[PDB]
């Protein structure tokens, strides 16, 4: 699954 | 080595969330028992336009006395407490204090919010996070 960051 | 730990987050009155796209709810902090403090963050209406169809779900490193590496897995608990719809990081990610990592498209809102699927018993969303910190 695509791991990303919001910070 | 590795330190594995978990947090269960119950979001009461989920159907009543007024969070618009980009607005976030954070959990209380948790740890392995530990100088580090973590929390979860959810965007009930997604982080952004690309993810407006979804709940976005993140692990945040809140307090850490320069970096740590951690694998993580999020799932939804059904009414029987069983894990369902799990997503797991394929590798460990580098966290610093104030950094989050997660899944922008964790679960379809159209799925989670349909009563037939039974994942909001008593209008509660229960998320379960497992973290493995590389030391």
From Swiss-Prot, chain A:
Has a dual function as a transcriptional activator and a repressor of the hedgehog (Hh) pathway. The full-length ci form (ciFL), acts as an activator (ciA) while ciR, its C-terminally truncated form, acts as a repressor. Involved in segment polarity. Required for the normal development of the posterior half of each embryonic segment. Engrailed protein directly represses ci expression in posterior compartment cells. This is Transcriptional activator cubitus interruptus. Disruption phenotype: RNAi-mediated knockdown severely reduces adult survival following the ingestion of E.carotovora. Abolishes Cad99C-dependent formation of endosomes and DUOX-dependent up-regulation of reactive oxygen species (ROS) in the intestines of adults fed bacteria-derived uracil. Belongs to the GLI C2H2-type zinc-finger protein family. Interacts with RDX. Interacts with cos. Interacts with slmb; the interaction is enhanced by phosphorylation by CkIalpha and dco. Polyubiquitinated by RDX in the presence of CUL3, which results in proteasomal degradation. The chain holds residues 1360 to 1366 of 1397 of the full protein. It comes from the Eukaryota. It is found in: Nucleus. Disulfide bonds: none annotated. The lineage of its organism: Eukaryota, Metazoa, Ecdysozoa, Arthropoda, Hexapoda.
Swiss-Prot record, chain B:
It is found in: Nucleus; Nucleus speckle; Cytoplasm. Residues 42-135 are annotated as: Required for nuclear localization. Residues 4-131 form the MATH domain. It comes from the Eukaryota. Changing residue 102 to V: In NSDVS2; dominant-negative, increased BET proteins stability. Residues 93-103 are annotated as: Important for binding substrate proteins. The BTB (POZ) domain mediates dimerization and interaction with CUL3. It is linked to Nabais Sa-de Vries syndrome 1: An autosomal dominant disorder characterized by global developmental delay, impaired intellectual development, speech delay, and variable behavioral abnormalities. Affected individuals show congenital microcephaly and dysmorphic facial features, including round face, small palpebral fissures, highly arched eyebrows, and short nose. Belongs to the Tdpoz family. Antigen recognized by serum from scleroderma patient. This is Speckle-type POZ protein. It comes from Homo sapiens. The gene is SPOP. The chain holds residues 28 to 165 of 374 of the full protein.
